[PDB]
A = this chain, B = another copy of it.
């Protein structure tokens, strides 16, 4: 899957491997509650963050640790991190792919939402 995060590296032209991703869900008290976490695989993908039943209606934040990624490569990047915040599953179940393309001073994200 219901949630997949895919991260590519625009400098090297490869998947961005081992990028930490933390997901949060907005709580009733308007706090961000830790919902899930993982690291992208060798293919730059992170599957298994949640299940269909667990991925309930709500507002989610997907936080991608871009800074740690670039610093590990010896680069001081511009952004502290990259966040994607969206309402999910408010009109029935969907499969969400959050895709992110990274450069040291830039990132681009899109969502692919299907049945």
Interface residue range, chain A = 20 to 34
- Copies per assembly: 4
Kindly identify, within residues 96 to 115 of chain A, every residue whose CB is under 8 Å from any CB belonging to chain B.
99, 101, 103-114
CB contact between A101 and one of B81, B85, B106, B114 (< 8 Å): that residue: B106
Stretch at the interface among A12-20, A33-41, A47-55: A12-20
Q: Which residue of B lies closest to A101 (CB)?
A: B110
Contacts of A9 in B (CB 8 A): 105
A109 to B14, CA, bound (A): 13
Given contacts A13-B110, A15-B112, A105-B111, 19 further A-B contacts (CB under 8 A): A8-B110, A9-B105, A10-B105, A10-B106, A10-B110, A11-B11, A11-B105, A12-B104, A12-B105, A14-B114, A78-B86, A79-B85, A103-B103, A103-B106, A105-B112, A106-B109, A107-B108, A108-B108, A108-B109
A residues contacting B by CB (< 8 A) are 8-15, 59, 78-81, 83-87, 99, 101, 103-114
